[PDB]
Amino acid sequence: DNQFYSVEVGDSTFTVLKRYQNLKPIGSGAQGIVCAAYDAVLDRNVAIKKLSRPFQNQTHAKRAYRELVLMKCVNHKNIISLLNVFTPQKTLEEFQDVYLVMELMDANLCQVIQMELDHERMSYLLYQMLCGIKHLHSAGIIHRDLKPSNIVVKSDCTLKILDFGLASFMMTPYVVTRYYRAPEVILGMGYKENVDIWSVGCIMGEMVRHKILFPGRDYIDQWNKVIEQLGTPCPEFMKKLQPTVRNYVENRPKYAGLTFPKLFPDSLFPADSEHNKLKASQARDLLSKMLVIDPAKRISVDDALQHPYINVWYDPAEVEAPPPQLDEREHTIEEWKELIYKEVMN
């Protein structure tokens, strides 16, 4: 009669409501482990993510808490929406794990990126990204760590952003992925909404080139890859760095940076018909307005949406949805436990 049951998926134990059957592993989420399942109440397939003792330290706690209050606020077809949240534990004192449940998708954007994609599909995924990002901004959320591994797609080309970005020790095995973070993030710069444009450009460029644009062990290597390719930023951009970070950067070797046709030659694009030739040059134009070091001359999110490569998909019902207490804290682990628990028990 217990309303829960336990199954072994991979290494992790999943204790879930009886409505969820046939759990099968599917991926890794750092914040937790994930599985596919059939939801018999809803008669549809779902994905279930287990957050193990999210209160065990401030990084897991802040993230877990932050994302519960937002998934309980945002509402947009391209942004994760939760179907259920639950814990199999009965009291706060026993409270351990949190399970999040959402619509089951077909692929992670890392998988899509390795595929050869026509312009119809590339422009559509990117357009969805910008729509989701635009919603986040309308809700007062600026992401600042959008990356492909936290983006999922359905076979029909529909897309969802699964996380809400940055707010820091992590005593774990797994590394954080930093290749898509804007310069202002790399350099401790302060930022505005089009910080997220940079990351879109990084994703789009990788779609074209099929390799990470700015790899590196550290922000050191990564900045090297940025200037080697795009050219040293404008002195005007220097003047906005902090003095110490400004000294480091100004003392880096100078680079002219390659043109975008060299950074993304026609070889990479479908360019057999006239239609495709024009699409490639539009694609390269957009890339050139997104992969821009100085945020001041980097294209907006609303301006990107209305770029010719992108605005073929326009619909005032998807770029124009209504946006619905600011939590911003730092607590002990028992404090975090109760705060998360209350939210789990809305």
Ligand X SMILES: Cc1nc2c(cnn2-c2csc(C(=O)NC3COC3)c2)cc1Nc1c(F)cccc1Cl
CB atoms within 10 A of CB 14: 24
Nearer to ligand X, 150 or 222 (CB): 150
* Partners of 28 in beta bridges: 33
**Structure tokens given for 166:** 């940055």
- Catalytic residue list: 145
Nearest distance in Å: CB 155, ligand X = 9
Burial label, 296 (beta-carbon count in 10 A; 0-12, 13-18, 19+) = exposed
> Any known ligand binding at 132?
no
CB atoms within 10 A of CB 42: 14
The closest residue (CB) to ligand X is 105
Nearest distance in Å: CB 197, ligand X = 23
Nearest distance in Å: CB 187, ligand X = 29
The residues binding ligand X (CB under 6 A) are 26-27, 29, 34, 36, 47-49, 80, 100-102, 104-108, 152, 162
Amino acid present at 130: L
> Any known ligand binding at 325?
no
> Any known ligand binding at 101?
no
Nearer to ligand X, 36 or 186 (CB): 36
DSSP SS3 for 117: coil
Q: List, as one string, the DSSP characters of 3-28.
A: SEEEEEETTEEEEEETTEEEEEEEEE
> Any known ligand binding at 293?
no
> Any known ligand binding at 32?
yes
DSSP SS3 for 90: coil
**Structure tokens given for 278:** 């024009």
> Any known ligand binding at 28?
yes
Nearest distance in Å: CB 206, ligand X = 18
d(CA 209, CA 191): 28
Nearer to ligand X, 48 or 204 (CB): 48
Nearer to ligand X, 110 or 312 (CB): 110
Query: Are 241 and 187 within 8 A, CB to CB?
Result: yes
Pick from 61, 64, 60, 103: which is nearest to 80 by CA? 103
> Any known ligand binding at 165?
no
Q: Rounded to the nearest 5°, which phi and psi values hold at 13?
A: -95, 130
Nearest distance in Å: CB 46, ligand X = 8
Q: Which residue has the tokens 């820091």?
A: 168
DSSP state of 312: G
Nearer to ligand X, 151 or 286 (CB): 151
Per the annotation, where are the binding residues for ATP? 26-34, 49
Residues annotated in the binding site, as ranges? 26-34, 49
